[PDB]
Amino acid sequence: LTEIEHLVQSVCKSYRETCQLRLEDLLRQRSNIFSREEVTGYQRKSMWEMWERCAHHLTEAIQYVVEFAKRLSGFMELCQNDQIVLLKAGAMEVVLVRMCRAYNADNRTVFFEGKYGGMELFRALGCSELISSIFDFSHSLSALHFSEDEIALYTALVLINAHRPGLQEKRKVEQLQYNLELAFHHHLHKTHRQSILAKLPPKGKLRSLCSQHVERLQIFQHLHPIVVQAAFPPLYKELFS
C-alpha cells in the first residue's frame, strides 16, 4: 500500500529469482556429505583445476548478483559510472553473505558441487587463511538465522551504499539507499526481528574480507586466467583489466 511495502515485494522478488538454489533444497542436502574418498579426490586435484572450478562458481555467483542489482528499483536509472562503482565494490560482499545459506554451522560444512563439505576440500588452492575467514564469516552470519527476506533487503543495502568513493550522482544513490533503509527497518518491525540489527556484521569486516578475497582472486587470474562471458562488460573490463 505505502509504496515502501511495494519496494519490499520488488526486492524480495528480485532476490527469489536471482537465487541459484532454494533454501529448502540447501537445507535437505545437509545429510548428503562428501566422503573422505571424494574429499581426497578434491585435495589430490591440481591447484589450477580447483581454481578453474571455484572461479566459475564465483563468476556465476557474481552474475546472479549483477542480475539482482539490475532487477532493483531505480538501479538502471543510475549512470554507468555509479553502476560500476557500486557493483565493483559490493557484488562480492553480497556473494559472501548469500554464502551463509549454503553453510551448515553443526558440521561446519558448505554445499559445494552437489554435496556438503569442510574447508579441507579446498587444500589444493593453498590459501587456507582466506578460506578459514570466509567459513568464519559464514559461521557468524549463520547465528543470525537470517530469513530469505532479511538476506534480500540486507544484500540490496550492501550493494546500494552512497559512501562508495567515485560516485558521480551521490545524491541519486542516497535516495535509493534511504528507501531501502526504510524498507528493511519497516520489514524488521512488522516481523519483530529488529534484534538482528545489533547482531549484523560491522561494515569494515565485510569490506576487509572481500578485499582479501578479491586480492587472492586477482592473483590467481594473473597466473591461470579463466574466461567469462560478461553480463556487465564495463565492470569486466574494469576488474579483469
Binding site for ligand Q3Y (CB under 6 A): 55, 58-59, 62-63, 66, 87-88, 91-92, 214, 217-218, 221, 226, 228, 230-232, 235-236, 239-240
* Nearer residue to ligand Q3Y within complex by CB, 191 or 218: 218
* Nearer residue to ligand Q3Y within complex by CB, 95 or 152: 95
- Report which of 208, 25, 14 is spatially closest to residue 101, judged by C-alpha positions: 25
Give one DSSP letter per residue of 194-209, joined into a string: TTHHHHSPPHHHHHHH
* Nearer residue to ligand Q3Y within complex by CB, 43 or 221: 221
The SS3 call for residue 90 is helix
State how far Cα 215 lies from the chain centre. 16
Query: Considering the complex, what minimum distance in angstroms separates the CB of residue 167 from ligand Q3Y?
Result: 16
Query: Considering the complex, what minimum distance in angstroms separates the CB of residue 47 from ligand Q3Y?
Result: 15
User: Residue 33: left (phi > 0), alpha (psi -120 to 50), or beta?
Assistant: beta
* Nearer residue to ligand Q3Y within complex by CB, 64 or 184: 64
- DSSP letter at 231? S
Query: Considering the complex, what minimum distance in angstroms separates the CB of residue 228 from ligand Q3Y?
Result: 5
